[PDB]
Design an enzyme around this catalytic site. Structure first.
Site, PDB file in Angstrom:
ATOM      1  CG  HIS A   1      -0.615   0.204   2.465  1.00  0.00           C
ATOM      2  ND1 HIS A   1      -0.476  -0.850   3.328  1.00  0.00           N
ATOM      3  CD2 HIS A   1      -0.380   1.325   3.193  1.00  0.00           C
ATOM      4  CE1 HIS A   1      -0.109  -0.395   4.518  1.00  0.00           C
ATOM      5  NE2 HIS A   1      -0.048   0.925   4.461  1.00  0.00           N
TER       6      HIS A   1
ATOM      7  N   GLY B   1       2.832   6.106   9.253  1.00  0.00           N
ATOM      8  CA  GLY B   1       4.274   6.116   9.294  1.00  0.00           C
ATOM      9  C   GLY B   1       4.906   4.882   9.912  1.00  0.00           C
TER      10      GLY B   1
ATOM     11  CB  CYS C   1       2.564   0.721   7.427  1.00  0.00           C
ATOM     12  SG  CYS C   1       0.819   0.599   7.926  1.00  0.00           S
TER      13      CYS C   1
END
Lengths: 304, 304
Positions: free
Chosen positions: A41, A143, A145
């Protein structure tokens, strides 16, 4: 003595964290040998995240659209591919800090250390269990992930988790390092259900043994029970059923303390039915299920 | 979202841990530049520990009686001296992994990360507060002395704690890196009292703000109070008195949530007097006092 939720030392993992940027989206990646692993993502805008077609989104992206940065130094991306929910970015430089590692798919009820990182910079470290419903109770924000979960056995780092998302209940979901989710989740911003969060019965027992080892024993009662008997009570409280394998796994702790597993079960049963009456066990006022028998042995033995 | 007790990443500290041996006693030391810092009781036999005369014991020891080992590699000891309760061993080699650091004497109520180490080998990491009675609630065993407590501000490691001993209550005691104990303790195996362990009121408040930030708000009541009023209730529960400085320190959290500090005090007062009624706050069934306002801001903001 004393018993504390503790994470593995994070040094070996710190050296593998990089920042991955694609358009305006930034998150963390894991740099091992000449590959950087990150959540796919990273290719999404905020709009795309509602219902991304990752195959279509990724096709608009070339190697040079992935900005990869370890500290102040850029890595050159020479290949990219998508494996399930992760991207692998091939870089022209092998991470000189790559430790011995493997990728493992962890079982529900097992624990692991999370190195929370923000846009490539390690932030802190804490222990999680993979819950029976394949969620974790972590601390994550935008931030974070691509932050990873791992275990260490002497010199080997076993990576088991990469962070992707948060559910409406405030719990967390993610993948192994092959990019396969734990649990039924998918990487898009829609409401998704984890289902009933059951308590890890074997871990509760282990922690009760921890307590006894560390001098807390007010809860040792005069009763015993059977597995079927205890499991009839377990179901009622959404505890996982206890099996002989769990009995066997608790063997070392049963021996060390001289308390039969079924006696401790009987004690756990009375705690479940009568509560704590305002008392505490290892400084908690509820029953803790995020310590494995290994976790308990490792700490109480201490050595290495 | 989510809120977790997390330690600083331990990598910078891992690289400074060595094993110090004198006779049959082994423990950890901290290797910074050309100095190794360790607990002076490394010079004691098990007998000596009951009532050691450290000045007399140390005089029987020469440089070559201190075996210092980082991994598999020996360090050459070229000088030794005793500063309060620590030895400084001068070695002929500057630690090439020395990070930027300072030594700090931490205030009661502040927190720090502990890197539990066994005979020179990092074992795990967890957060502690320095309690108002200058003890910590840790996890320590033989072999873990010389493990250190620290904070990290970007690239600077602030060492604040070295582990020395356990009290009859199962809590822990130790020194700053100048070897001065926190609290009234001395390094000999006799029974010693920490005194009444008071609750860090400002930290409880911060954690209540954390909770609100992370969606837990069932405990927000319709009352307010005054400092004197709240402090009359504080004394009764052995809470530390709240001062304006604490009010001011909570400023950012009060603003972020829109809840006046004295309103949160009133809420804390009702929790103290009426208990939790079997409910939980950030997954705890008691009032948590080991998170500072900084700790809370750092996590909830997340960045860096």
């Amino acid at each position: 003595s004393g018993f504390r939720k503790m994470a593995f030392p994070s040094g070996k993992v710190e050296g593998c964290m990089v920042q991955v940027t694609c358009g305006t989206t930034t998150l963390n990646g894991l740099w091992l040998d000449d590959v950087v692993y990150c959540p796919r993502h990273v290719i999404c805008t905020s709009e795309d995240m509602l219902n991304p077609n990752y195959e279509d989104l990724l096709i608009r992206k070339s190697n040079h659209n992935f900005l990869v940065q370890a500290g102040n130094v850029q890595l050159r991306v020479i290949g990219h591919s998508m494996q399930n929910c992760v991207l692998k970015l091939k870089v022209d430089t092998a991470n000189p800090k790559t430790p011995k590692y493997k990728f493992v798919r962890i079982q529900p009820g097992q624990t692991f250390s999370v190195l929370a990182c923000y846009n490539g910079s390690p932030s802190g470290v804490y222990q999680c269990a993979m819950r029976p419903n394949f969620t974790i109770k972590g601390s994550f924000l935008n931030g974070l992930c691509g932050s990873v979960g791992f275990n260490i056995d002497y010199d080997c780092v076993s990576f088991c988790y990469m962070h992707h998302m948060e559910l409406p209940t405030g719990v967390h979901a993610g993948t192994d390092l092959e990019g396969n989710f734990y649990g039924p989740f998918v990487d898009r911003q829609t409401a998704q259900a984890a289902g009933t969060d059951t308590t890890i019965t074997v871990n509760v027992l282990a922690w009760l043994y921890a307590a006894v080892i560390n001098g807390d024993r007010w809860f040792l009662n005069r009763f015993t029970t059977t597995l079927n008997d205890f499991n009839l009570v377990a179901m009622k409280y959404n505890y996982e059923p206890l099996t002989q394998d769990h009995v066997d796994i608790l063997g070392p702790l049963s021996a060390q303390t001289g308390i039969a597993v079924l006696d401790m079960c009987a004690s756990l049963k009375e705690l479940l039915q009568n509560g704590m009456n305002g008392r505490t066990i290892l400084g908690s006022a509820l029953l803790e299920d995020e310590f494995t028998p290994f976790d308990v042995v490792r700490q109480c033995s201490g050595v290495t």
